[PDB]
Amino acid sequence: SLNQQRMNGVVAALKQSNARRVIDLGCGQGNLLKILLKDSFFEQITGVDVSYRSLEIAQERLDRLRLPRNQWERLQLIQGALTYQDKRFHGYDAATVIEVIEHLDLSRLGAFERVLFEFAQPKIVIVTTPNIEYNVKFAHRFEWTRSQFQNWANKITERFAYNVQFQPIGEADPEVGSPTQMAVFIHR
C-alpha cells in the first residue's frame, strides 16, 4: 500500500541520517511509533499529539507488542498542541511530521513552524503530505500542490537554519508526479 510505502520511506530516510532519537509530531494513533519501537536501531521513540484519546489508543496498540529486555523504556507519549513550545521537544536527532501540515490552518501553521524549526530545532525534519494534483487526475480538497509544498519548504530554509531535499513516495506520474510528497530538512 501507499501508507506502508510511506512508513518505509520515512524509516529509510531516518536511518540514512543516522537519526536514532526520534520525536513524531502529531503522532495520532501510533502507526509510525509501532514500527519505530520494534526496531532496535532506534533509541528514543517519542510521540506527541494534542488529543489524549489518540495517545490513549496508541498506548493500547503499542502494548500489544512483545519486546525484549529494556526496549520498552525507549518509548514516550506526550500530549501537547503542535503550536505549544514544550521543553521536552529539545534533543532529538529527528522530528517526523507525517500527513499533518495540510490539516493545520494558516494561523497555527505559523506557530507550528517556530516550535519545530526554531525551538525544537532537531538535526533532521521529515515531512510528508499528499499531492492534490495526483489525487485529482487519478480518482480531499485540503491537500497541497507540489508547488505549494515546495514554496513552503524553501520559505522554511530562508527563515530557519535548514536546507531541504525532496523525494518521491508512491509510483510517480510523468506529469502530476507522485501521490505522496516528502521533504527532508537538514540543519546547517
UniProtKB/TrEMBL annotation:
The keyword Transferase applies. It comes from the Bacteria. GO terms for molecular function: metal ion binding; RNA binding; small RNA 2'-O-methyltransferase activity. S-adenosyl-L-homocysteine binds at residues 49, 82. The keyword Transferase applies. Keywords: Magnesium, Metal-binding, Methyltransferase, RNA-binding, RNA-mediated gene silencing, S-adenosyl-L-methionine, Transferase. GO terms for biological process: regulatory ncRNA-mediated gene silencing; RNA methylation. Belongs to the methyltransferase superfamily. HEN1 family. This is Small RNA 2'-O-methyltransferase. The chain holds residues 263 to 461 of 461 of the full protein.
